[PDB]
């Protein structure tokens, strides 16, 4: 019926963003004009080379490695077409 189609067009088409569940769901709807290279800097501009001190500048050793390797999980492609049709008789579908 239209219910299937009405449901089919809306959902399969670009509601994939949340296909993984979990947090992975979005559903989200001049300066420095110039420099003067001649003007002096008298030994305290070159302090650009200061030491880190207590600034961090490094990754926490936690995030340097991730077992997931930032890959997708396997895609089981759950689709509206898969929910409207029967299990043991895919050709036929429930009241829809």
């Amino acid at each position: 019926s239209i219910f299937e189609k009405d449901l089919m067009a809306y959902f399969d088409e670009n509601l994939n963003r949340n296909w993984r569940g979990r947090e992975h769901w979005k559903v989200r709807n001049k300066k420095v004009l110039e420099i003067d290279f001649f003007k002096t800097d008298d030994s305290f501009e070159d302090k650009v080379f200061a030491s880190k001190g207590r600034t961090k500048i490094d990754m926490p050793i936690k995030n340097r490695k991730n077992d997931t390797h930032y890959l997708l999980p396997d895609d089981f492609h759950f689709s509206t077409d898969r929910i409207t049709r029967l299990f043991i008789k895919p050709g036929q579908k429930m009241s829809l």
């Binding site: 219910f3 449901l7 809306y10 959902f11 509601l15 949340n18 296909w19 993984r20 569940g21 979990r22 769901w25 999980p73 396997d74 895609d75 089981f76 759950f78 689709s79 509206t80 929910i83």
Partner: peptide
């Protein structure tokens, strides 16, 4: 993963249907 992806698709269609 199969269960998570199943719900991730089915609960939305039930609520929005």
């Amino acid at each position: 993963e199969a269960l998570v992806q199943a719900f991730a698709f089915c609960i939305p269609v039930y609520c929005f249907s």
